[PDB]
């Protein structure tokens, strides 16, 4: 009935909607870059966590973060029965009757929007184009601030399995941080002090099939605002596209592997040594696509700016140092917009 309450896309697709409603249809300029992406000209960066202390993988990790901003993590310790469980339980929640799922809506009373809960992202203006997907957005860290009213009670083991999966990726977070601290020549607890009691979120994305996969986005082109993201996809058939130098490339998170991409917070803190990739998801006609992304932010203690240990005489500050409040407002507000916030920091 109004633009502040957008529809659940899964139920639109399940209805057999003849064509995407105008609220999801892209403009002419945006539609010439999405229907076709190229393949990776260079093979996909892969890192083995079991030998990440070795000198060969560190060079592989450095090349990944400096040339692409993302990499596939293999041999990560997280058991496959756990990765399948958290994915299967996510699928069972999305396949519940809609009236059960609206109890966990992110529109409080069906009216006032908030981030946490089941739905889509914030609709700022009436003519804002919506993504062709829904997501279940939940806070996982710190545990004390967890709102269990939004954690699905059915299937009954969702809360325990998510809690168990989150602790496993948090340890992966700390192992990737220690390795990145060695590539930058910085001390470990520079990041850990900023990760202490820091926010972390779990985003369950559901990408329904679309009747016109050439007119919509599953998720808008964007870069994450976190420090970095740990992504898990359920039998990825395709859809994720990453941008480099204006050119879009297809990337496929193979099963049992975790994709880890850097966010905008890391690019500023490492003074642009490593990059934060702009990425998107495109739909297709037949099959739905489910992914879970673990987003790890920094706390609110230190300003968002290049690490002082990285600003020697040969390489000065390439970004401005900004307060944390001013940073999160820019990231949160520019997600629905075309321009990218972090570019305004470049000096
Ligand atoms: C933490 C933040 O970076 C993320 C969410 O807000 C929405 C999904 C994409 C990403 O931008
Ligand atoms: O669905 C994907 O493959 C990417 C996930 C993503 O971009 C996000 O949730 O921020
Ligand atoms: Co993303």
Distance CA 191, CA 291 (A): 27
CB of 328 within 8 A of CB of 205?
no
Residue 338: count other Cβ atoms within 10 Å of its Cβ.
9
Distance CA 316, CA 291 (A): 39
The CATH number covering residue 53 comes to 2.60.120.330
What lies within 8 Å, CB to CB, of 37 at 6+ separation is 241, 248, 249, 250, 282
Q: Judge whether 127 is annotated as a binding position.
A: no
Say yes or no: CB of residue 224 within 6 Å of ligand 1.
yes
Strands 219-222, 46-48: pairing is: unpaired
Say yes or no: CB of residue 319 within 6 Å of ligand 1.
no
Q: Tell me, in angstroms, the distance from the centre of ligand 3 to residue 314's CA.
A: 33
Residue 69 within any structural domain of the chain: yes
Residue 1 within any structural domain of the chain: no
Could you identify the atom of ligand 1 that is nearest to the CA of residue 201? 1
Into how many domains does the chain fold? 1
Residue 220 within any structural domain of the chain: yes
Distance CA 107, CA 117 (A): 8
- For the record, the structure tokens of 120 come out as 């889509």
Distance CA 199, CA 140 (A): 8
CB of 70 within 8 A of CB of 76?
no
Q: Tell me, in angstroms, the distance from the centre of ligand 2 to residue 166's CA.
A: 17
List strands edge to edge, sheet with 258-262.
Answer: 46-48, 70-74, 258-262, 228-233, 289-296, 200-207, 134-141, 117-119
Cis peptide preceding 142, ω within 30 of 0: yes
Helix (H) or strand (E) holding 243: strand 240-244
Could you identify the atom of ligand 2 that is nearest to the CA of residue 224? 10
* Solved using: X-ray
CA angle centred on 202, ends 154 and 256, rounded to 5°: 90
Q: What are phi and psi of 261, to 5 degrees?
A: -120, 145
Say yes or no: CB of residue 220 within 6 Å of ligand 2.
no
Q: Tell me, in angstroms, the distance from the centre of ligand 1 to residue 229's CA.
A: 9
Least Cα distance to 189 among 320, 296, 268, 307 occurs for 307
Least Cα distance to 184 among 276, 298, 61 occurs for 61
Residue 193 within any structural domain of the chain: yes
Strands 112-113, 107-108: pairing is: antiparallel
Say yes or no: CB of residue 221 within 6 Å of ligand 1.
no
Could you identify the atom of ligand 1 that is nearest to the CA of residue 225? 3
Distance CA 9, CA 23 (A): 11
CB of 61 within 8 A of CB of 258?
no
**Which residue has its alpha carbon closest to ligand 2 atom 1?**
291
CB of 180 within 8 A of CB of 194?
no
Residue 219 within any structural domain of the chain: yes
Least Cα distance to 68 among 279, 225, 254 occurs for 279
Say yes or no: CB of residue 291 within 6 Å of ligand 2.
yes
Say yes or no: CB of residue 281 within 6 Å of ligand 2.
yes
State the resolution, in angstroms.
Answer: 2.4
Strand partners, 135: 119, 205
Instruction: Give me the residue label for tokens 């993201």.
Output: 229
CB of 260 within 8 A of CB of 71?
yes
- For the record, the structure tokens of 42 come out as 């260079």
Distance CA 208, CA 189 (A): 41
CB of 282 within 8 A of CB of 213?
yes
Residue 301: count other Cβ atoms within 10 Å of its Cβ.
11
- Measured CA to CA in angstroms, residue 19 lies from 133, 151, 159, 289 at distances of 15, 33, 36, 19
Say yes or no: CB of residue 335 within 6 Å of ligand 1.
yes
Residue 116: count other Cβ atoms within 10 Å of its Cβ.
18
**Which residue has its alpha carbon closest to ligand 1 atom 4?**
224
Q: Tell me, in angstroms, the distance from the centre of ligand 2 to residue 17's CA.
A: 25
Q: Tell me, in angstroms, the distance from the centre of ligand 2 to residue 131's CA.
A: 12
Q: Tell me, in angstroms, the distance from the centre of ligand 2 to residue 6's CA.
A: 20
**Which residue has its alpha carbon closest to ligand 2 atom 9?**
293
Range of the domain at 131: 9-345
């Amino acid at each position: 009935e109004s633009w502040r309450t957008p529809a659940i896309v899964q139920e639109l697709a399940a209805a057999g909607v003849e064509e995407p409603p105008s609220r999801y249809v892209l403009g002419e300029k945006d539609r010439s870059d999405e229907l076709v992406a190229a393949e990776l000209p260079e093979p996909i960066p892969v890192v083995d966590l079991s030998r990440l202390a070795g000198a060969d993988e560190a060079a592989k990790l450095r090349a990944a973060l400096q040339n692409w901003g993302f990499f596939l993590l293999t041999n990560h310790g997280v058991e496959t029965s756990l990765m399948d469980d958290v994915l299967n339980l996510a699928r069972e929640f999305f396949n519940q009757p809609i009236e059960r799922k609206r109890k966990f809506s992110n529109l409080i009373d069906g009216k006032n929007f908030q981030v946490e809960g089941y739905g889509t992202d914030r609709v700022v203006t009436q003519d804002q184009i919506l993504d062709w997907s829904d997501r279940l957005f939940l806070r996982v860290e710190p545990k004390e601030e967890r709102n269990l009213a939004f954690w699905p009670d059915h299937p009954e083991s969702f809360r325990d399995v998510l809690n168990e999966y989150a602790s496993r990726t948090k340890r992966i977070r700390d192992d990737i941080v220690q390795a990145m601290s060695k590539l930058l020549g910085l001390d470990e607890d520079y990041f850990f002090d900023r990760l202490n009691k820091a926010p972390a979120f779990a985003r369950f994305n559901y990408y329904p099939p679309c009747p016109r996969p050439d007119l919509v986005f599953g998720v808008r082109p964007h870069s994450d605002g976190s420090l970095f993201t740990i992504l898990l996809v359920d039998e990825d058939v395709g859809g994720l596209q990453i941008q480099r130098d204006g050119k879009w490339y297809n990337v496929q998170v193979t099963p049992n592997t975790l994709l880890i991409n850097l966010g905008d917070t890391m690019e500023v803190l490492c003074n642009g040594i490593f990059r934060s990739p702009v990425h998107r998801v495109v739909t297709n006609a037949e099959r739905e696509r489910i992914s879970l992304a673990m987003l790890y932010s920094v706390n609110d203690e230190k300003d968002i700016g290049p690490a002082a240990g990285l600003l020697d005489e040969n390489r000065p500050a390439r970004y401005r140092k900004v307060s944390v409040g001013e940073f999160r407002a820019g990231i949160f507000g520019k997600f629905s917009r075309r321009e990218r916030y972090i570019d305004s920091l470049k000096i």
